[PDB]
Design an enzyme around this catalytic site. Sequence first.
Site, mmCIF file in Angstrom:
data_model
loop_
_atom_site.group_PDB
_atom_site.id
_atom_site.type_symbol
_atom_site.label_atom_id
_atom_site.label_comp_id
_atom_site.label_asym_id
_atom_site.label_seq_id
_atom_site.Cartn_x
_atom_site.Cartn_y
_atom_site.Cartn_z
ATOM 1 N N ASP A 105 33.171 -1.297 -35.769
ATOM 2 C CA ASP A 105 32.441 -0.075 -36.094
ATOM 3 C C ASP A 105 33.192 0.626 -37.214
ATOM 4 O OD1 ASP A 105 30.574 1.999 -36.151
ATOM 5 O OD2 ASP A 105 31.646 3.061 -34.450
HETATM 6 C C1 LIG Z 1 26.136 4.680 -34.084
HETATM 7 N N1 LIG Z 1 27.584 4.618 -34.455
HETATM 8 C C2 LIG Z 1 28.052 5.810 -35.169
HETATM 9 C C3 LIG Z 1 27.255 6.316 -36.368
HETATM 10 O O1 LIG Z 1 27.013 5.186 -37.193
HETATM 11 C C4 LIG Z 1 25.911 5.271 -38.093
HETATM 12 C C5 LIG Z 1 25.906 6.253 -39.156
HETATM 13 O O2 LIG Z 1 24.547 6.790 -39.366
HETATM 14 C C6 LIG Z 1 24.384 7.557 -40.548
HETATM 15 C C7 LIG Z 1 23.388 6.915 -41.569
HETATM 16 O O3 LIG Z 1 22.614 5.705 -41.103
HETATM 17 C C8 LIG Z 1 22.625 7.825 -42.511
HETATM 18 O O4 LIG Z 1 21.166 7.638 -42.607
HETATM 19 C C9 LIG Z 1 23.104 9.287 -42.425
HETATM 20 N N2 LIG Z 1 22.106 9.841 -43.227
HETATM 21 C C10 LIG Z 1 21.480 11.020 -43.301
HETATM 22 N N3 LIG Z 1 20.530 11.072 -44.278
HETATM 23 N N4 LIG Z 1 21.743 12.017 -42.529
HETATM 24 C C11 LIG Z 1 23.866 9.908 -41.215
HETATM 25 O O5 LIG Z 1 23.443 11.146 -40.695
HETATM 26 C C12 LIG Z 1 24.328 8.977 -40.149
HETATM 27 N N5 LIG Z 1 25.302 9.379 -39.170
HETATM 28 C C13 LIG Z 1 25.202 9.934 -37.967
HETATM 29 N N6 LIG Z 1 24.146 10.241 -37.392
HETATM 30 N N7 LIG Z 1 26.292 10.192 -37.292
HETATM 31 O O6 LIG Z 1 26.274 5.658 -40.394
HETATM 32 C C14 LIG Z 1 25.668 4.376 -40.267
HETATM 33 C C15 LIG Z 1 26.442 3.419 -41.193
HETATM 34 C C16 LIG Z 1 25.740 3.911 -38.811
HETATM 35 O O7 LIG Z 1 26.956 3.105 -38.666
HETATM 36 C C17 LIG Z 1 24.495 3.176 -38.259
HETATM 37 O O8 LIG Z 1 24.642 2.714 -37.095
HETATM 38 O O9 LIG Z 1 27.715 7.353 -37.146
HETATM 39 C C18 LIG Z 1 29.100 7.442 -37.360
HETATM 40 C C19 LIG Z 1 29.523 8.536 -38.313
HETATM 41 O O10 LIG Z 1 28.427 9.112 -38.914
HETATM 42 C C20 LIG Z 1 30.040 6.965 -36.439
HETATM 43 O O11 LIG Z 1 31.383 6.696 -36.959
HETATM 44 C C21 LIG Z 1 29.544 5.815 -35.528
HETATM 45 O O12 LIG Z 1 30.312 5.295 -34.599
#
Ligand SMILES: CN[C@@H]1[C@H](O[C@H]2[C@H](O[C@H]3[C@@H](O)[C@@H](O)[C@@H](NC(=N)N)[C@@H](O)[C@@H]3NC(=N)N)O[C@@H](C)[C@]2(O)C=O)O[C@@H](CO)[C@H](O)[C@H]1O
Length: 267
Positions: free
Chosen positions: A184
């Site tokens: 992750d």
């Molecule tokens: C589900 N796991 C967590 C989460 O991961 C997410 C995280 O999701 C993000 C984006 O997809 C993006 O659209 C993003 N975009 C927006 N336009 N708001 C983010 O808000 C988003 N993060 C979040 N909700 N915490 O970034 C992506 C790369 C991810 O790894 C997808 O699974 O978000 C993280 C940090 O944001 C954490 O470190 C994780 O452990």
Amino acid sequence: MIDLTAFLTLLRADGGDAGWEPVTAAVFRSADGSRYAKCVPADQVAALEAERDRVSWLSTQDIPGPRVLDWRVGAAGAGLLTSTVEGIPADRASASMLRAAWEPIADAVRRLHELPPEKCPFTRELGEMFSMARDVVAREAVNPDFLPEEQRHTPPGELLARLAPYVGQRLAQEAAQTVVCHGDLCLPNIILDPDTLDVAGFIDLGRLGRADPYADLALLFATARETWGDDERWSQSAEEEFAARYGIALDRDRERFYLHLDPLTWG
Ligand SMILES: CN[C@@H]1[C@H](O[C@H]2[C@H](O[C@H]3[C@@H](O)[C@@H](O)[C@@H](NC(=N)N)[C@@H](O)[C@@H]3NC(=N)N)O[C@@H](C)[C@]2(O)C=O)O[C@@H](CO)[C@H](O)[C@H]1O
């Protein structure tokens, strides 16, 4: 929803007035900031045990991360106590700060990805992760906040279907190029030394294990793009530079597959 009464009981069990407080299956921090705990209900204990194992084993691999301080179990679940990795979570860095850290992060992640994968006790291979996605999507349990912005209004069953026919091809690429992945590798899980901006260590290790390196690089690059901002041109340079330091030739289609699968795997 969060079993604070059960979890605290675990954390307080050794006394010593530690001032445990929730900071998010919850994460807690001690008052003095030197210890964290992750606790889970009875139903999730095997998963937390496997996290404990991953953290303990990584401490024997010369890759910087927390130490396991304690493992505590009862009828209402389990807790995993770890030492704080001191420093600043990479998501909180400015662009300039993340640029100082960028080659150190490529070095640190290269070191992790240089562990001999067949010697790793753990796995997060695609057949496991794709199966998890099928399950989450069947349970209608996908958090759309995790999806790429442009997918947030698409039903996750449709999004899974876009990936499903590529699983064979992606398994063949994974067989060809497996590493031990962090599992992750989003910026909040990379702690930076706040003075040198070298990598202090990795946290949130419960998905550590064999997988295609893009299971890690997709997340790292997508989350760094939150920092680099509107700058499409620096973001591409940054990724090319990362790829040269780390030692891989970018495969964007493979990177995108991993970016699009990961959200479907949580819940
Ligand atoms: C589900 N796991 C967590 C989460 O991961 C997410 C995280 O999701 C993000 C984006 O997809 C993006 O659209 C993003 N975009 C927006 N336009 N708001 C983010 O808000 C988003 N993060 C979040 N909700 N915490 O970034 C992506 C790369 C991810 O790894 C997808 O699974 O978000 C993280 C940090 O944001 C954490 O470190 C994780 O452990």
